[PDB]
Each structure stands twice: as structure tokens, then as C-alpha cells.
């Protein structure tokens, strides 16, 4: 009605927006525009003052630096990194041969959320997540086990995060300010993959520095301790060594378990290569026997592109069709060997 038409000229038109400093029990509001300003605003309604909290942005009318009403904008650079999204088209069934290993991590993350009936009647409740890692280059393949968790509720894919090493925030509350904004939109999962904080030997380049940078990484160490860790906000860590975390951090969590990704054997190589070629039809002239037999202890990704490097040179001969000229050139890549290497060298 006439409400919106009457009060639109009170705040604007060219109004400025500052930041709320503190809240007084006398109803006087102190707003700070950038930079170094104060004011007294008395408003008894439209608040919503509890959801605000200090250190937030509020409107300021031109006459005179007063707030017509408060809104929730942005909020903060950290909340934006959750989207988007992920929830891809991939599922946990798209990989195989790890079914015995994946049933431990899949059932642990599916214990909350779906099937809550036996979760609430228990009233203990291990919502600790897991910790992932493995050779030679894996540990993001264990993230492919979380692609089913990515499709479950809200997911956050994180490698090295952002604010950890680059520039610090204020306290552990950054994850906890994510927890309070998630509690409306919950559940959620926050992944951790390949931490580069301690992974780098020589940091780039010379900084403030060889000592203190360890102390601002120690800020991350206490940020994950944490005060006070209660709910989820699931935490799944992936990195080389877990020993970077102090035993004082394990006391709040997470004490559940950590798994390692073993080298997939010939039964797993053929299964991983089969499901990728299941939905999207393969070629009949290329046999899967000589591919898995000629290799020993290799991932599912490595068996894939050795057939691509054959199709790589194939287009130089200008063949989109399946041609037997590549069959020998692919068998030549089997005779080329070189798939695996590792020391050794000794006779034992």
C-alpha cells in the first residue's frame, strides 16, 4: 500500500551505509561509517537486533546519519567460497574395487542426515568424519569417494583454503560464523584436501616469516582444535602427514578414524576402467585384459590416458573412426612399458 511509497524518500535517495559499532541498552545505536564516525539512533522496532550482532553493516539515512532499518547483506568473503556447489553428476558407484574400503567412509557420513532414526535413538553419535590420504598421487581420489557426499546437502571443496596462509581472520569464529549461518541451511560438509601450509619447504619467498609464519600457521592449529567444537560442519582432512596436529587438538576431535588408499590391483583397475566406459560406450577391438595385465599397482586414471596417448597420435593419421592401425600402436604402447617406476634398485 502507501507504506512503501511514503517511506522510500525518508532514507534516500543518495544515502550511505556504514557499519554498526556497538549496541546500547538505552536503545541508542552507534553506527560507524568508514572511517571513524559515530551517531545515536533510537528505534524501538524492526529489530531483528539479535540476528544482527555487532560488526555488521547497517543503513544510514542522510538526515541525519540514522538507520531506517537493518538488512542482512554479503556476508563476509568466507561464506561465498562454499558455492558453487558442488554436487556433480558423479556418484560413489562410479568407482569400483574400493567397495570394501569405501563402505567405511560412506556409512560413516550417511549415519547422520539420512537414516537419522537410529542416529537420534542412540544419543551417544560419531559425527567426527574421517581423514584421507594415500599414494602415489591419490588422496584426491578419496575425494571422489566424497562426490556422493558432495551430492548430499551442502558441500565445500577446499584445497589449502584461502584465509589460512594468505591472510588471517579473527579467531576460530570464521568456521563458527559459518556454523551459525549454516544452522538455518544445514546440514553441511567442509572438506580439507592437500594442505600446502607445511607442505612447502621454502615458502614464497622471504617473509615475516621463517618464524612467525609458523605462528600464524599455529593460529590454524588452534583454529581446528577447537573452541568450542560441538556439531558439524563435517571435517574431512586430506594431506601427507597428520602429525602436524598436536595431541591437544585430538581431544575435541576428530578421534573417529583415518583411512589410507592402497594401490589398486588388477581387479580394481579393470573395474574402475569399466564403469567409466560403462555409461559411455567403449570400443570392442580394445581388450581390457592386456591393459590390466601389463601394469602392476597403478591407479584408474593412469590406465585411462595410456589409451588416450594412442588416440592422441591416432588423429595425426586423421581417423575419427575406430581403426586397426591404432590397435598395434596401442599394443606398441603396451610394448613401450614405462607405466610404473620406483626404487628399489636392489636384489632382495
Amino acid at each position: 500500500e502507501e507504506e512503501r511509497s511514503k517511506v522510500d524518500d525518508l532514507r534516500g535517495t543518495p544515502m550511505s551505509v556504514g557499519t554498526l559499532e556497538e549496541i546500547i541498552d538505552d536503545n541508542h545505536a552507534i553506527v560507524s561509517t568508514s572511517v571513524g564516525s559515530e551517531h545515536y539512533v533510537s528505534i524501538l522496532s524492526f529489530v531483528d537486533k539479535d540476528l544482527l550482532e555487532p560488526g555488521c553493516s547497517v543503513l544510514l539515512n542522510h538526515k541525519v546519519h540514522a538507520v531506517i532499518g537493518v538488512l542482512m547483506d554479503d556476508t563476509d568473503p568466507l561464506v561465498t567460497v562454499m558455492k558453487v556447489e558442488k554436487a556433480p553428476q558423479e556418484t560413489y558407484a562410479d568407482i569400483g574395487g574400493l567397495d570394501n574400503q569405501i563402505q567405511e567412509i560412506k556409512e560413516s557420513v550417511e549415519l547422520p542426515l539420512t537414516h537419522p532414526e537410529y542416529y537420534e535413538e542412540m544419543g551417544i553419535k560419531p559425527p567426527k568424519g574421517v581423514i584421507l590420504y594415500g599414494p602415489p598421487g591419490t588422496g584426491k581420489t578419496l575425494l571422489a569417494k566424497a562426490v556422493a557426499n558432495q551430492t548430499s546437502a551442502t558441500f565445500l571443496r577446499v584445497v589449502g583454503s584461502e584465509l589460512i596462509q594468505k591472510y588471517l581472520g579473527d579467531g576460530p569464529k570464521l568456521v563458527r560464523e559459518l556454523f551459525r549461518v549454516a544452522e538455518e541451511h544445514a546440514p553441511s560438509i567442509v572438506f580439507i584436501d592437500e594442505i600446502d601450509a607445511i607442505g612447502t619447504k621454502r615458502y614464497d619467498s622471504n617473509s615475516g616469516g621463517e618464524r612467525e609464519i609458523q605462528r600464524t600457521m599455529l593460529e590454524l592449529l588452534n583454529q581446528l582444535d577447537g573452541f568450542d567444537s560441538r556439531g558439524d560442519v563435517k571435517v574431512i582432512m586430506a594431506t601427507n602427514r597428520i602429525e602436524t596436529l598436536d595431541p591437544a587438538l585430538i581431544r575435541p576431535g576428530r578421534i573417529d578414524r583415518k583411512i589410507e588408499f592402497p594401490l589398486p590391483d588388477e581387479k580394481t583397475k579393470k573395474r574402475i576402467f569399466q564403469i567409466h566406459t560403462s555409461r559411455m560406450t567403449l570400443a570392442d577391438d580394445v581388450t581390457l585384459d592386456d591393459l590390466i595385465m601389463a601394469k602392476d599397482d597403478l591407479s584408474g586414471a593412469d590406465i585411462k590416458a595410456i589409451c588416450t596417448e594412442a588416440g592422441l597420435m591416432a588423429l595425426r593419421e586423421r581417423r575419427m573412426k575406430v581403426t586397426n592401425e591404432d590397435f598395434k600402436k596401442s599394443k606398441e604402447n603396451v610394448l613401450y612399458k614405462k607405466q610404473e617406476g620406483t626404487p628399489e634398485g636392489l636384489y632382495l
Binding site: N206, G208, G209, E210, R211, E212
Partner: protein, 134 residues
């Protein structure tokens, strides 16, 4: 120039070493009174000196005595003024200190306790080691 010190007399009061008493009187006072010895023989007089401690005393006593006795011609530097203030510029102070050193002649400059402000660039701590290098 707000500093001060008695002597004069405190020059010869320390008593030793006799070779350091006579030499510091030469390298300082002789270029002032007799530049002819440098230009006629064709030798460069020393433009600087270093007095370090504390294997004994006489650093601040003997040098500042000639300073205070030289009256309006002198320059004093405390190690606390090099760090100056947050995002402060002491690079123009070093250029100014030697600029006025070329005005008043012969000027004499005292820099004491340089271990903190003489920072090496081998190990560079935080953000504050580079401004020492500047």
C-alpha cells in the same frame, strides 16, 4: 645539539692509553688547523673512525669531550632515532645527517650501540628487518 658534557679537562683525565690520547687529538684537530699537509704531500686524510667497547672505558668520555668543546660544530645520533616510528622514514635522516655534516665543518658524528640498528640481511625477521637494511 641539546647534549652537554664537562671538559676540556676530561680529555687527559682518563690517562690511557697515551697513544690513543695523542692520536685522537691528531686525526681530528690537525685536518681543521692544517689542511696544507694533506694537499702538499698529496694524501687523503681519514674521514671516519671507529671506537668500540666495552674493553675498558673512554668511548663516550674522550669523544664527547672534544664534541662538547667544539661547541656549535658537532652532530649527535642516538640509536633510538633510527627506528623512528611505525612506517617512519629514517632514510632521509641518514641523508640529512650527512648533508648537514657537509655544511658544518669539520663535523663530528657519534653513533652508539649499533648492534640493534646495524641489522644484517642474512636473517631478515618479520617486516622490521628491511627498514633497518634501508
Amino acid at each position: 645539539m641539546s647534549h652537554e658534557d664537562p671538559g676540556n679537562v676530561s680529555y687527559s683525565e682518563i690517562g690511557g692509553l697515551s697513544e690513543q690520547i695523542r692520536e685522537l687529538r691528531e686525526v681530528i684537530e690537525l685536518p681543521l688547523t692544517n689542511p696544507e699537509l694533506f694537499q702538499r704531500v698529496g694524501i687523503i686524510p681519514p674521514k671516519g673512525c671507529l671506537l668500540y667497547g666495552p674493553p675498558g672505558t673512554g668511548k663516550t668520555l674522550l669523544a664527547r669531550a672534544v664534541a662538547s668543546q667544539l661547541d656549535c660544530n658537532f652532530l649527535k645520533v642516538v640509536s633510538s632515532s633510527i627506528v623512528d616510528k611505525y612506517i617512519g622514514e629514517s632514510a632521509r635522516l641518514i641523508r640529512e645527517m650527512f648533508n648537514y655534516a657537509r655544511d658544518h665543518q669539520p663535523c663530528i658524528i657519534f653513533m652508539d650501540e649499533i648492534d640493534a640498528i646495524g641489522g644484517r640481511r642474512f636473517s631478515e625477521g618479520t617486516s622490521a628487518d628491511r627498514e633497518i637494511q634501508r
